[PDB]
Amino acid sequence: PKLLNRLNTYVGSSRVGKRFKLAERNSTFTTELRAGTATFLTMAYILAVNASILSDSGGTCSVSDCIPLCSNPAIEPSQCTGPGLRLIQPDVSCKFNPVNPGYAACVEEIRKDLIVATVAASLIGCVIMGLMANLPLALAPGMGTNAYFAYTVVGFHGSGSISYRTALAAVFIEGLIFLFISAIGFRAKLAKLVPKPVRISSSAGIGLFLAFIGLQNNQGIGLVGYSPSTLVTLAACPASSRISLAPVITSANGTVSLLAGGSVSGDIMCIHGRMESPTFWLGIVGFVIIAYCLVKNVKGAMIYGIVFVTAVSWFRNTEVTAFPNTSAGDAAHDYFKKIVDVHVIKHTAGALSFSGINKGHFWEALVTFLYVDILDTTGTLYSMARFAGFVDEKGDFAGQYFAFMSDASAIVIGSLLGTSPVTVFIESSTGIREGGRTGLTAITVAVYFLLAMFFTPLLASIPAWAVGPPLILVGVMMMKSVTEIDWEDMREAIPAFVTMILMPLTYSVAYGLIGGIGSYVVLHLWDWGEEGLVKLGFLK
Amino acid sequence: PKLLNRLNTYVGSSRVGKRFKLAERNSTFTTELRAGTATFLTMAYILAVNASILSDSGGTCSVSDCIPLCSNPAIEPSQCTGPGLRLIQPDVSCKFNPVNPGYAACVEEIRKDLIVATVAASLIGCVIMGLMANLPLALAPGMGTNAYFAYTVVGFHGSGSISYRTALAAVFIEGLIFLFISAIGFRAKLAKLVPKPVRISSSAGIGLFLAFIGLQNNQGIGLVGYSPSTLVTLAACPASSRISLAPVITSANGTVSLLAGGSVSGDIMCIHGRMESPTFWLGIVGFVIIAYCLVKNVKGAMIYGIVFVTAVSWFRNTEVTAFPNTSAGDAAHDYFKKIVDVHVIKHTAGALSFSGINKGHFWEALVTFLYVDILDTTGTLYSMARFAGFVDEKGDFAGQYFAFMSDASAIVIGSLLGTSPVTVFIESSTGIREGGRTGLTAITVAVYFLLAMFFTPLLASIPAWAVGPPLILVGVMMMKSVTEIDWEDMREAIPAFVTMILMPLTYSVAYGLIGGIGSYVVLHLWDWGEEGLVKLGFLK
Ligand SMILES: *[C@@H]1O[C@H](CO)[C@@H](O[C@@H]2O[C@H](CO)[C@@H](O)[C@H](O)[C@H]2NC(C)=O)[C@H](O)[C@H]1NC(C)=O
Ligand SMILES: *[C@@H]1O[C@H](CO)[C@@H](O[C@@H]2O[C@H](CO)[C@@H](O)[C@H](O)[C@H]2NC(C)=O)[C@H](O)[C@H]1NC(C)=O
Ligand SMILES: Nc1ncnc2[nH]cnc12
Ligand SMILES: Nc1ncnc2[nH]cnc12
């Protein structure tokens, strides 16, 4: 017949084919390859988004990486010897605007490390799932955990209450706890512990949080900027027309004086030229591209949008350039010039630190990671099994036990490599729809991730306005869970709304979850007391 | 029979009873009285929320009512004569933090005007609807337009692009345009101009916008404050631990110098004591009270939460007091002492100004007022028409023609009195469910508004944390429309998501409408272009 059919039958009748149960699942080798290719195309936006998001966290970079700066900007620090001229020792404010060049270079190195870490974590998770669980599921650092880890647990450039190393330890212990509870069967009980409206609306809240991130400046396309009165207004003015803010002291006359040691923001206040930034409009074009490719059921929509925006931003002397005419931009372009590079993780791998265990914020982050991972994986795996028709009458799909252990072990491995918790993407369904039934789909995705490595220079040059629209569209897709909330019932609507609005507004998944659970408990206190009195017999 | 039955038969058979068609609609006098009482209780929260929101707009007064202040705060301006001592002439910054005592005396006076304007607009609108349309519908300044008018069109203390007087002309002309198109039958044609996903998700977007306002400081309970890195984090620290912000100029050193003339914010940045403000926790208790009363189907749920929080805030020497131990607090308490007062509108009535017609921002507000009023009234009026069973096979309910002109005429009257556009409340369904069928229900509601006056001192003493939870809980109810969006269709989900998320984030109803309509048009260009070619014949 055809060489393709010969390869298919040879693989299916081989030892590997029987090990992967290719014949028993009605697909042998080319269907698995196509399913893996489709899954990788649909999920490969993570290679950009996760790396950029976790890089905004600052990584292991600290004040010790900040170089001393001269008294005047016109003199390079080596020539900073003269009358009235001195070297300014860096403090905590070196991490934030204006960012110390040494810290920025360290953050770029951390970005390369995090690209490699994302690739390696996705590869290892896919290999573990394909081999030990034998399911067509691809694993990679999850988006919700990505944003929560970067901008809430650690904060922008380590401005949060938990350091990057302590957050890595939190992710590691979270993965260990998830593996422990999965190995016994308490995972379903801890999943049912979360109230149904809160559990359903957590996905929509995380989507709103991701879209809000995609609508910021250092994070996405802009269009949302600081407002003195409303706190938030229309951004997307050019970067030349953005100014910083610092805390001040008011009085009864108006002597607004600067607060010494205040944490100056980035460039978030637009003075003029609203809706005129070319980077925002390039992001909008990428958003339109991804939206049309999603409408047309085109696999790799976010890939195409990110690639288009990044390629437009790769030109050197434009207003949308990813390599500005600065020392940092020159270094970024120099690294981008070498298309291929085998980058070795230097600062991020094995950067765990268990020093902050006794702190409450560490355990808040750990519990939020654990609940997000449990709910996400429980929903996703069973949705996949219903997609692949692996669900029996009992509601199980055979390899679920090893699937959950694979997810937890991949979380632990990714924490060791220095990334936010990794989980099974819903994009895996794209492979299942293509005919993927065995673990060879996961192995194909892992090989594609391997080929994604060696392109770290090509991936480290992706600007914020390219990260941008993928975040908003991920929010759009995650917003579909709102239809499962009984909005007519206030005991269901109010907790769901509280979660859904507190995740983007408080800008924290943990705070949204806490508020939703608290509101649910408070609103059901009356009903629970009534049923308790009835059970005791005081009421009929 | 009983004495009550005698009243029902006498009124029903009288000239008034036949004029109102009490017999023909199977309810004569007491049912209308209970329906009017039920509608008013479910709606009376607007007596508190509307005036408080529109007061933050700054009202009709300018810097011209800011008093000159002495150079040092320790000397009253009359004694500001000495060496190195001078009177500081007020500038634009007198309106904002720190607020000039002269301008703070406006908002207290303006709030009293807006309380009467809220009642008089509600009273006149109900009477017009009850008499000319003969429907059990109550009219009041609509929550959809209050916040947009105050915080977006005019801005906080007149910081927006349109003055309060010019915004009143926008409402006045909006009422005239709405009356004209309704009178000629083109209202339905303009209603279908807005795309379906944008029209449905605009209600959810305004609810998120209102709930966000309920989570601010000058607007609601707090819990959302400024963040140097994320622009929003967890507020609800005590007012003593909140600090202002001013724009600064960064460099390559760190010499952040204050930007002269910068617009200093309020007190939005928490330094310490997060989740410790008693006023936020008092608001949370009021949130729980309304939430349970909403769960238990208790009419007037939002009154009880507002009244409870306001009553606790009426004590003089607490941390949740509405009358702080200041000159403004003493004056506010002094007015609160007289329980009854017949306040006469002095600054707000007849404060129209057509000077800003040529400006683009005037027409952006005018069109947004028109579409919000058109979509709200069309959706709201036909909503109760099913409740009262007035809809025939053709889809109209007899008095619909005068129902829309009653709404439009009341908008013109409300603008003359100086309030945000008034509309038919969905809370009118409460009286209809109680049996209200004629215009006597609206007249009964209008009479309750007469009693709402003579209590302006009792209503002007309502703190921000009392407005608070009603704003959040209104957003919960308006959130139920998301279930009508086809979230699986990206051509419907993306425009709906953009409409829904831009209203709180850009903090503007107009921007959410523009972005959602713009994204809808772009996402349908391929479909419209393909269909257009088929009509031309180039494609099959
Ligand atoms: C406004 O009031 C303050 C005191 O509340 C005046 O005092 C100044 O305060 C700042 C810092 O608090 C000092 O740097 C100044 O040296 C103080 N000046 C004096 C004369 O004491 C301040 O002068 C007042 N500002 C204006 C413009 O009048
Ligand atoms: C860093 O460089 C800036 C100038 O670019 C210095 O700014 C000082 O403060 C204001 C703003 O320019 C000027 O009036 C001063 O003349 C500036 N000083 C000098 C010597 O020019 C700033 O001094 C530098 N940062 C530090 C800590 O010295
Ligand atoms: N956290 C997550 N869970 C499932 N699928 C995802 N795709 C991207 N992030 C994901
Ligand atoms: N704008 C509005 N439309 C209908 N009902 C409302 N209730 C409060 N505000 C309303």
Side-chain angles (χ1 to χ4, degrees):
Chain A
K2 185 67 176 177
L3 188 153
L4 207 72
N5 291 318
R6 291 170 81 223
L7 174 67
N8 272 339
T9 182
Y10 171 70
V11 170
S13 57
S14 76
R15 281 82 65 193
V16 176
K18 293 182 183 293
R19 186 249 182 261
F20 279 114
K21 299 180 179 67
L22 294 169
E24 322 196 358
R25 305 207 181 153
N26 306 313
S27 66
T28 58
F29 202 45
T30 58
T31 301
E32 302 310 316
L33 292 200
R34 305 329 164 201
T37 307
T39 297
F40 173 71
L41 287 184
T42 312
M43 77 182 314
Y45 67 94
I46 197 69
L47 296 164
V49 183
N50 172 43
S52 289
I53 289 178
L54 290 190
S55 297
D56 273 311
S57 178
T60 60
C61 302
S62 57
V63 184
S64 64
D65 302 300
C66 282
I67 67 170
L69 284 175
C70 191
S71 297
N72 53 3
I75 294 190
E76 198 271 330
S78 73
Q79 289 101 21
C80 185
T81 52
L85 209 69
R86 66 185 184 273
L87 281 178
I88 319 184
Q89 292 308 114
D91 55 327
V92 176
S93 67
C94 80
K95 285 140 55 143
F96 323 102
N97 215 39
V99 188
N100 201 316
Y103 191 81
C106 181
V107 164
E108 290 318 295
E109 297 323 297
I110 279 291
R111 180 174 181 145
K112 301 170 198 159
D113 280 17
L114 286 174
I115 294 172
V116 180
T118 293
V119 167
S122 315
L123 190 153
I124 292 164
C126 289
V127 165
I128 293 172
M129 186 71 96
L131 287 172
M132 180 187 50
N134 191 7
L135 291 167
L137 309 166
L139 280 76
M143 277 304 313
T145 299
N146 272 350
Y148 175 60
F149 183 100
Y151 299 115
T152 306
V153 180
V154 187
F156 177 80
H157 287 181
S159 61
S161 56
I162 289 300
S163 66
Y164 177 78
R165 307 196 183 243
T166 311
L168 285 189
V171 172
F172 172 85
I173 296 169
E174 184 271 329
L176 282 189
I177 285 156
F178 187 40
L179 180 82
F180 171 76
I181 65 157
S182 298
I184 312 181
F186 288 179
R187 187 208 79 257
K189 278 167 228 155
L190 275 72
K192 81 177 183 179
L193 188 153
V194 181
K196 179 176 181 286
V198 177
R199 184 247 300 159
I200 294 168
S201 63
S202 67
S203 169
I206 287 164
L208 286 182
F209 175 49
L210 287 172
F212 193 14
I213 287 176
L215 293 161
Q216 302 259 32
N217 221 40
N218 83 93
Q219 297 174 355
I221 58 163
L223 185 149
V224 168
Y226 163 87
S227 179
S229 65
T230 80
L231 178 54
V232 288
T233 42
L234 199 69
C237 65
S240 55
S241 50
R242 294 184 98 112
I243 57 175
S244 296
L245 307 150
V248 301
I249 297 86
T250 53
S251 76
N253 54 2
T255 185
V256 287
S257 71
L258 202 74
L259 177 71
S263 67
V264 175
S265 77
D267 284 337
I268 51 174
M269 192 194 197
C270 284
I271 43 176
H272 65 279
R274 293 203 308 190
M275 305 282 303
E276 289 174 35
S277 50
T279 64
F280 155 78
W281 286 114
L282 184 60
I284 283 301
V285 170
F287 180 88
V288 166
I289 288 180
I290 306 179
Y292 266 124
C293 290
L294 284 175
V295 164
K296 300 289 94 175
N297 285 97
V298 166
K299 293 169 288 183
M302 293 180 183
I303 301 299
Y304 303 152
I306 290 167
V307 159
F308 176 82
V309 173
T310 317
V312 174
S313 289
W314 279 344
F315 289 86
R316 194 68 205 279
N317 288 304
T318 68
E319 303 297 316
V320 296
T321 185
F323 320 116
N325 287 341
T326 69
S327 277
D330 285 357
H333 188 251
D334 269 7
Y335 187 58
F336 160 80
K337 269 194 201 157
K338 45 165 73 72
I339 317 296
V340 286
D341 177 47
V342 182
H343 183 84
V344 174
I345 310 173
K346 294 181 176 67
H347 312 137
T348 300
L352 266 54
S353 179
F354 302 92
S355 305
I357 295 171
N358 51 64
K359 287 183 307 205
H361 288 112
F362 171 92
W363 288 107
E364 175 209 290
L366 192 146
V367 170
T368 307
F369 282 140
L370 180 63
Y371 285 165
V372 163
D373 280 329
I374 284 171
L375 299 183
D376 190 3
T377 303
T378 300
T380 291
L381 288 196
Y382 284 97
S383 174
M384 295 296 172
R386 294 182 185 275
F387 266 119
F390 284 148
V391 169
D392 55 3
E393 312 180 349
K394 293 182 183 293
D396 294 330
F397 53 102
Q400 60 170 1
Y401 190 71
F402 292 111
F404 286 101
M405 273 191 267
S406 313
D407 193 272
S409 310
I411 289 167
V412 169
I413 297 308
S415 76
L416 286 172
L417 286 166
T419 193
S420 68
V422 308
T423 55
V424 187
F425 288 177
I426 312 148
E427 288 87 344
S428 300
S429 58
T430 304
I432 288 159
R433 201 185 317 121
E434 294 293 328
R437 304 284 175 262
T438 79
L440 275 186
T441 298
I443 305 304
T444 308
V445 175
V447 170
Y448 272 126
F449 271 115
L450 194 51
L451 307 174
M453 183 179 72
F454 315 130
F455 287 106
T456 299
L458 188 65
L459 292 167
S461 310
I462 296 169
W465 48 100
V467 181
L471 297 174
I472 308 155
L473 284 152
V474 162
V476 174
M477 294 182 286
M478 293 177 71
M479 193 68 178
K480 71 167 57 64
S481 79
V482 297
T483 51
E484 293 179 353
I485 296 291
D486 192 6
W487 293 107
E488 308 300 321
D489 193 353
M490 287 291 108
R491 316 207 300 288
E492 305 299 285
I494 289 163
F497 185 88
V498 161
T499 301
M500 185 180 289
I501 200 153
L502 286 196
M503 278 189 196
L505 286 195
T506 66
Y507 206 92
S508 168
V509 170
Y511 289 165
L513 285 175
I514 290 165
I517 292 165
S519 60
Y520 184 94
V521 168
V522 165
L523 287 191
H524 285 74
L525 274 181
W526 186 335
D527 278 327
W528 291 336
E530 209 178 30
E531 66 183 1
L533 290 190
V534 169
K535 286 183 184 292
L536 192 147
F538 279 166
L539 273 79
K540 267 77 71 178
Chain B
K2 276 79 69 177
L3 190 142
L4 199 69
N5 290 319
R6 296 168 80 222
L7 180 66
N8 277 340
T9 61
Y10 166 83
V11 172
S13 56
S14 75
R15 281 82 65 193
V16 175
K18 293 182 183 293
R19 186 249 182 261
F20 280 114
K21 299 180 179 67
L22 294 169
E24 321 196 358
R25 305 207 180 153
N26 306 312
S27 68
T28 56
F29 201 45
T30 57
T31 292
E32 310 299 331
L33 293 200
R34 312 321 172 201
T37 306
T39 295
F40 173 71
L41 293 182
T42 310
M43 182 179 72
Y45 69 94
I46 199 70
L47 299 169
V49 176
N50 175 49
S52 288
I53 287 178
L54 290 187
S55 296
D56 282 313
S57 158
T60 59
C61 83
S62 58
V63 183
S64 67
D65 290 331
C66 279
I67 67 170
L69 284 174
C70 195
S71 84
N72 61 5
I75 294 191
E76 197 271 330
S78 73
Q79 288 101 21
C80 202
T81 52
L85 208 68
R86 66 185 184 273
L87 281 178
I88 297 169
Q89 292 308 114
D91 55 327
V92 176
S93 67
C94 79
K95 284 140 54 144
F96 323 102
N97 215 39
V99 187
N100 199 316
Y103 191 84
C106 292
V107 172
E108 182 65 26
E109 293 323 298
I110 284 291
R111 187 177 181 148
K112 302 169 198 159
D113 285 16
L114 292 177
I115 289 171
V116 181
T118 292
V119 172
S122 297
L123 194 156
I124 293 163
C126 287
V127 165
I128 293 172
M129 179 69 75
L131 286 170
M132 183 178 72
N134 191 8
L135 290 168
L137 310 165
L139 279 75
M143 287 297 312
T145 61
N146 296 117
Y148 174 61
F149 183 97
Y151 300 117
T152 305
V153 180
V154 188
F156 177 79
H157 287 181
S159 61
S161 55
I162 290 300
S163 66
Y164 177 83
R165 303 198 182 244
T166 310
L168 286 186
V171 173
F172 171 84
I173 295 169
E174 188 274 331
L176 286 187
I177 285 156
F178 185 40
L179 188 153
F180 167 74
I181 63 156
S182 181
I184 65 175
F186 284 0
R187 185 209 80 257
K189 312 220 182 303
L190 264 55
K192 71 180 182 180
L193 196 66
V194 179
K196 181 176 182 286
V198 178
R199 184 245 300 159
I200 295 167
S201 63
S202 69
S203 169
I206 292 165
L208 292 181
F209 174 51
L210 286 174
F212 192 13
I213 289 173
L215 299 161
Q216 300 275 38
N217 222 42
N218 82 93
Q219 297 174 356
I221 58 163
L223 185 149
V224 169
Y226 167 86
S227 177
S229 61
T230 80
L231 184 51
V232 286
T233 61
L234 200 67
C237 64
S240 55
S241 50
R242 294 184 98 112
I243 51 167
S244 295
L245 306 150
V248 300
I249 297 89
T250 54
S251 79
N253 281 330
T255 175
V256 287
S257 70
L258 203 74
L259 177 71
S263 68
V264 175
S265 77
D267 284 337
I268 51 174
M269 192 194 196
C270 284
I271 43 176
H272 65 279
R274 293 203 308 190
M275 305 276 306
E276 289 173 37
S277 51
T279 65
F280 154 79
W281 284 115
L282 181 62
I284 284 301
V285 172
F287 183 86
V288 169
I289 288 182
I290 307 178
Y292 270 105
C293 289
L294 284 177
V295 163
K296 300 287 97 175
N297 295 115
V298 166
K299 292 170 288 182
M302 293 180 183
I303 298 299
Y304 307 149
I306 287 169
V307 162
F308 176 83
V309 172
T310 315
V312 175
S313 290
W314 281 344
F315 290 86
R316 194 68 206 279
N317 289 304
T318 68
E319 303 298 316
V320 296
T321 185
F323 320 115
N325 288 341
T326 69
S327 296
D330 290 357
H333 186 70
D334 269 7
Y335 189 58
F336 162 80
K337 289 293 292 297
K338 44 166 73 71
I339 317 297
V340 287
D341 185 74
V342 182
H343 183 82
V344 174
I345 310 174
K346 294 181 176 67
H347 311 137
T348 300
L352 266 53
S353 180
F354 302 92
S355 305
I357 295 171
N358 51 64
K359 287 183 307 205
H361 287 112
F362 174 90
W363 293 104
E364 179 207 293
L366 190 144
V367 170
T368 307
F369 283 141
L370 183 63
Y371 285 165
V372 162
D373 282 329
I374 283 174
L375 296 183
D376 190 4
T377 310
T378 298
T380 296
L381 280 195
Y382 284 99
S383 173
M384 283 74 74
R386 273 69 173 267
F387 278 123
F390 285 150
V391 167
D392 56 3
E393 311 180 349
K394 293 182 183 293
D396 63 358
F397 51 99
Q400 66 165 0
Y401 185 70
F402 291 104
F404 285 97
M405 313 206 283
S406 307
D407 188 273
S409 308
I411 291 168
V412 170
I413 301 308
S415 68
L416 293 169
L417 291 165
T419 192
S420 67
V422 306
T423 56
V424 185
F425 282 12
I426 309 152
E427 285 89 344
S428 299
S429 59
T430 304
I432 287 159
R433 193 201 317 131
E434 294 293 328
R437 304 284 176 263
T438 79
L440 274 186
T441 296
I443 302 304
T444 306
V445 169
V447 169
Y448 275 119
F449 277 112
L450 274 172
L451 315 183
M453 293 177 70
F454 321 127
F455 286 106
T456 299
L458 188 65
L459 292 167
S461 310
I462 303 194
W465 45 101
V467 181
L471 289 175
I472 307 157
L473 280 154
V474 159
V476 179
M477 293 180 183
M478 294 177 71
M479 187 66 204
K480 68 170 57 65
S481 75
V482 300
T483 53
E484 293 179 353
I485 297 292
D486 192 7
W487 292 107
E488 308 299 321
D489 194 353
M490 271 314 112
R491 315 207 300 288
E492 307 295 282
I494 290 161
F497 189 88
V498 167
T499 305
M500 188 195 303
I501 200 168
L502 285 197
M503 293 180 183
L505 290 196
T506 67
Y507 184 76
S508 169
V509 169
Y511 291 164
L513 289 176
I514 292 165
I517 291 167
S519 63
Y520 183 93
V521 167
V522 165
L523 283 190
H524 283 75
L525 281 181
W526 192 334
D527 276 329
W528 293 336
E530 204 183 30
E531 166 80 17
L533 293 184
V534 173
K535 277 184 176 289
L536 192 147
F538 278 167
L539 273 79
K540 267 77 71 178

